[PDB]
Structure formats: C-alpha cells, structure tokens
C-alpha cells in the first residue's frame, strides 16, 4: 500500500538521484510533503511486479521504451498536461511518450550514446570502426587498450548493429510492424560480425560490462569508451582530459544509436496523483529543478525548451544531439521488453563463441523474440 501525503520516486542508479532529492527537499519546503528518492536495482523489472500487486513508488523514471508495456499492464495513471505546459517541451519528446493517442508520462531528457575519448592518449580519435583494430595494436605496445565499452547490455552494441541496415521493428504506416523484424537482415549480421571479429582478435573482451569499462576509461587505461551523458560526471572527477564526439562509422554509414527519452510516469495506484503532477510540472520541469539534477549527473539534451537553450552551448551536448539525429527514437511499444531480452541473449552468445553470428540472430528472429513476446504476455 502506498502512503497518501508522500512521494516515493524511483530512478536508475546511473542517473542523478541526489540532485532529484534536492528538488525533493525544495518541494518539501514549499508544500510539506516528504519526497523519498530511491534507486533500486533491476528497476524496470521490479516496477511491474511490485506495482501490479501493492504498490511500488508514486513516480517512476525510465527511458520511454518501457512505458507502453506499463500502460498496457494498467500501471500508469494517464497524465493531464494542458497545451500551455506541452509547448514548454519539444514536440518530438511528447511523441516518444504517446501511446494509442494518449500521453502516459512526462518527458525529461534526450539520451544518446556518444564516443568519449582520452585526448592525452588519443588526440585525434578514429572516425571509423574499421580504424580501431590498428589503433589497439598501437596502444597495446604502450600498455593500454583502444576501446572498452559495455558488451552485456544491447543498448551499447546496437549503434553498430543498426549502422548498416539493422533495425528492431519496421516503421511502417505507422505504427510499428511487430511481424517485420530487422534483426537477421544483412546490416545486422554485418554489424555483429564486425563486433565478434574485434573479440576474436583480442581487441575487446566478451564479458566487459558497465563497471569494468568505466573503471578502465576513468583510470586512464583506455583511449575510448561509449557511454551516455550520465557518465560525464565521473569522468570529470577522474580528471581525465576527455572529449565527446560522433560515433564511428561502419562501411561509411553512421552508427545509429537507439535514442531514449528519460521519462516520468505516475503509478496508477498512487493516491498522490496531484502531488506528483505538481512535483513534475512545477518543481522538476523548471530551469531550476533540471539544474539540480543535471549538476549531479547530466541528463543530456533536456526536454524543457528554456533550459535546453543554455545546455546546447555545451559541445558535449551538441555531440549527443549529433549522435541522436543519426539514430532513431526507440519504439515505446510493449514488445520492446521481449525484444531487449532476446537480443541480449543473442549478442552475449555470439560474443562468447557459444554460437556464430548467423546462428545467434537466426534463432532470435525465427523463435526467441516471439517466444519471449508470448512469455511476457502470458504472466511468466
């Protein structure tokens, strides 16, 4: 059961949960309502189990891609922003939180992976994926490593799979065709094949993860990483002189990172729907509230127009938007959960040699996405 006269907010560990707590304490001062911010693990999996029963947090933060499945499960209170509120945010960020004609969450910020590089180790970063092997060989002679990024989560490898023609679900009227999967087409095979080639030649490791890759770049042992704006705060701390820049091309085609819209939904079983609406519209989506959060750990290109005009000055945010333009907004449909689960098995297996690239993502299309779609939609 959720307590009336209180807000509990859930956001991911990698985001600025402490800045958001400052917006919490400001809210507390004005209204008397205590705001408790939490960053539990496997947040996106924990919210559905907990909220369906009883009852979870009042407000949930995640990128938009998971919110269709949440609305479809009945978990999100349909929001009620008026026209004046809407026009303070960029039209395409509203689109990412629209589902069956209705808005279901407030959009916060636009997240896109970029190439992050060490200027001292690598003044002039490589423009292409094809240049990386040779660079790694040149850096292995001096004890260091060319590129180290998270290979456990498909969000990070996707830019390379999509680069040459791969895609999740086709767009369409539309409308996304869940029968038309672009995950065993030639562009994906080519992107994943290239990735597994880097791993066969000892240029990357299969079992590199978010922690390991961050530690590596931040302690000056890698020339390059691939991360989002949330990670800039800790590179700042490490003192590594770094730059954020366009993702490398593959066969001359831009890397196409899936673009996420950090979003806030109101739990459907919360008795504090108004307090939540007040919190999000009047405290968070202000220059001042988005400042507090952005200063803990940056959001990227925020959805609020007035504050974005101050942030577009940052070269590192111009690079984030450069990369987002080259990419595609993520679908928000419910079958994204299924899609993500399956793709994560395929890539891990392909990357570890358990299967070949052609086997891994032939199984994916032919059975795993549909099997997982059916498993998610059946109860377990």
Ligand X SMILES: OC[C@H]1O[C@H](O[C@H]2[C@H](O)[C@@H](O)[C@@H](O)O[C@@H]2CO)[C@H](O)[C@@H](O)[C@@H]1O
x-or-dash string of contact with ligand X, 87-126, rule CB under 6 A: ------------------------x---------------
DSSP assignments along 182-207, one per residue: ESSSHHHHHHHHHHHHHHHTTSS-TT
- The answer to whether the peptide bond before residue 175 is cis (omega within 30 degrees of 0) is yes
Q: Which of 63, 223, 224, 319 binds ligand X (CB under 6 A)?
A: 63
Tokens of 122: 């690598």
What is the closest distance, in whole angstroms, from the C-beta atom of residue 175 to ligand X in the complex? 21
Mark residue 262 as left, alpha or beta (left: phi above 0; alpha: psi -120 to 50; beta: remaining). beta
- Closest to ligand X by CB, 153 vs 281, is 153
Q: Is 66 a binder of ligand X (CB under 6 A)?
A: yes
User: Would you state the structure tokens that stand for residue 369, as one six-digit string?
Assistant: 């996405």
Short-list 279, 263, 271, 264, CA closest to 24: 279
Closer by beta carbon to ligand X, 27 or else 70: 70
Q: Does 155 bind ligand X (CB under 6 A)?
A: yes
Residue closer to ligand X by CB (options 272, 372) is 372
Contact 79, 266 (CB under 8 A): yes
Stretch of residues binding ligand X (CB under 6 A), selected from 62-70, 173-181, 237-245, 316-324: 62-70
Query: Which of 126, 166 has the CB closer to ligand X?
Result: 166
> Is residue 61 part of the contact set for ligand X (CB under 6 A)?
no
Burial of 346 (0-12, 13-18, 19+ CB in 10 A): buried
Judged by CB under 6 A, the stretch of 147-155, 265-273, 313-321, 348-356 that binds ligand X is: 147-155
Q: How far is the CB of 274 from ligand X (least distance, A)?
A: 28
Nearest to 370 by CA among 233, 241, 185, 178: 178
Nearer CB in complex with ligand X: 189/297: 297
Measured from the CB atom, is 115 or 139 closer to ligand X? 115
State residue 35 phi and psi, 5-degree precision: -115, 120
- Looking at 58-66, 94-102, 116-124, 346-354, which segment touches ligand X (CB under 6 A)? 58-66
The answer to the question of residue 153 lying near ligand X (CB under 6 A) is: yes
By CB under 6 A, the residues from 331 to 360 that bind ligand X are 340
66 vs 277 by CB, closer to ligand X: 66
CA–CA gap between residue 80 and residue 371 (Å, rounded): 36
Residue 244: CB minimum distance to ligand X, A: 16
Q: Go through 176-187 and write b for each residue having 16 or more CB atoms within 10 A of its CB, e for each that does not.
A: bebeebbbbeeb
Of positions 16, 68, 69, 154, contacts ligand X by CB under 6 A: 154
Beta-bridged to residue 60, according to DSSP, are: 10, 265
Please report how close the Cβ of residue 145 comes to ligand X at its closest, in angstroms. 22
DSSP codes joined into one string, 196-240 = HHHHHTTSS-TT--HHHHHHHHHTT-EEEEEE-GGGHHHHHHHT-
Q: What is the smallest separation between the CB atom of 67 and ligand X, expressed in angstroms?
A: 10
- Angle made by CA atoms 146, 152, 156, in degrees to the nearest 5: 65
Question: Could you tell me the CA-to-CA distances from 32 to 24, 56, 221 in Å, in that order?
Answer: 11, 21, 48
Q: Which of 125, 260, 289, 331 binds ligand X (CB under 6 A)?
A: 260
Residue 64 CB, nearest approach to ligand X (Å): 8
Place of tokens 């956001």: 11
SS3 179: strand
x-marked contacts with ligand X along 8-37 as a string, rule CB under 6 A: ----x-x-----------------------
Binding segment for ligand X (CB under 6 A), chosen from 60-68, 97-105, 195-203, 235-243, is: 60-68
# residues near ligand X by CB under 6 A: 12
**Minimum gap (Å) between residue 312 Cβ and ligand X:** 20
Nearer to ligand X, 159 or 248 (CB): 159
Quote the Cα angle for 273-70-31, to 5°. 20
Q: Under the rule (CB under 6 A), what is the footprint of ligand X?
A: 12, 14, 44, 63, 65-66, 111, 153-155, 260, 340
């Amino acid at each position: 059961k959720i307590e009336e006269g209180k807000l509990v907010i859930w956001i991911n560990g990698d985001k600025g949960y402490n800045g958001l707590a400052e917006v919490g304490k400001k809210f507390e001062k004005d209204t008397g309502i205590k705001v408790t911010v939490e960053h539990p693990d496997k947040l996106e999996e924990k919210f559905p189990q907990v909220a369906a029963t009883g009852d979870g947090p009042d407000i949930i933060f995640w990128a938009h891609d998971r919110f269709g499945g949440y609305a479809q499960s009945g978990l999100l209170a349909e929001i009620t922003p008026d026209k004046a509120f809407q026009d303070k945010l960029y039209p395409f960020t509203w689109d990412a939180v629209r589902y069956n004609g209705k808005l279901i969450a407030y959009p916060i910020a636009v997240e896109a992976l970029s190439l992050i590089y060490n200027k001292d180790l690598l003044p002039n970063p490589p423009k292409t994926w094809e240049e990386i092997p040779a660079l790694d060989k040149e850096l292995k002679a001096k004890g260091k490593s060319a590129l180290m990024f998270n290979l456990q989560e498909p969000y990070f490898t996707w830019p390379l799979i999509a680069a040459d023609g791969g895609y999740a679900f086709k767009y369409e009227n539309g409308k996304y065709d869940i029968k038309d999967v672009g995950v065993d087409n030639a562009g994906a095979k080519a992107g994943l094949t290239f990735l597994v080639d880097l791993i066969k030649n000892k240029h990357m490791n299969a079992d590199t993860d978010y922690s390991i890759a961050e530690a590596a770049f931040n302690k000056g042992e890698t020339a390059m990483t691939i991360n989002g704006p949330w990670a800039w705060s800790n590179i700042d701390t490490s003192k590594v002189n770094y730059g954020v820049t366009v993702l490398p091309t593959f066969k001359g085609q831009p890397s196409k990172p899936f673009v996420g819209v950090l979003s806030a939904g109101i739990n459907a079983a919360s008795p504090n729907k108004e307090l939540a609406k007040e919190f999000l519209e009047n405290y968070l989506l202000t220059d001042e509230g988005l400042e507090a959060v952005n200063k803990d750990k940056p959001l990227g290109a925020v959805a609020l127009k007035s504050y974005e005009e101050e942030l577009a000055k940052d070269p590192r945010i111009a690079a984030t938007m450069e990369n987002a333009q080259k990419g595609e907004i993520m679908p928000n449909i419910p079958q994204m959960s299924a899609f993500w689960y399956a793709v994560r098995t395929a890539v891990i297996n392909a990357a570890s040699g358990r299967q070949t690239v052609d086997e891994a993502l032939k199984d994916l299309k032919e059975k795993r996405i549909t099997n997982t779609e059916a498993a998610i939609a059946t109860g377990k």
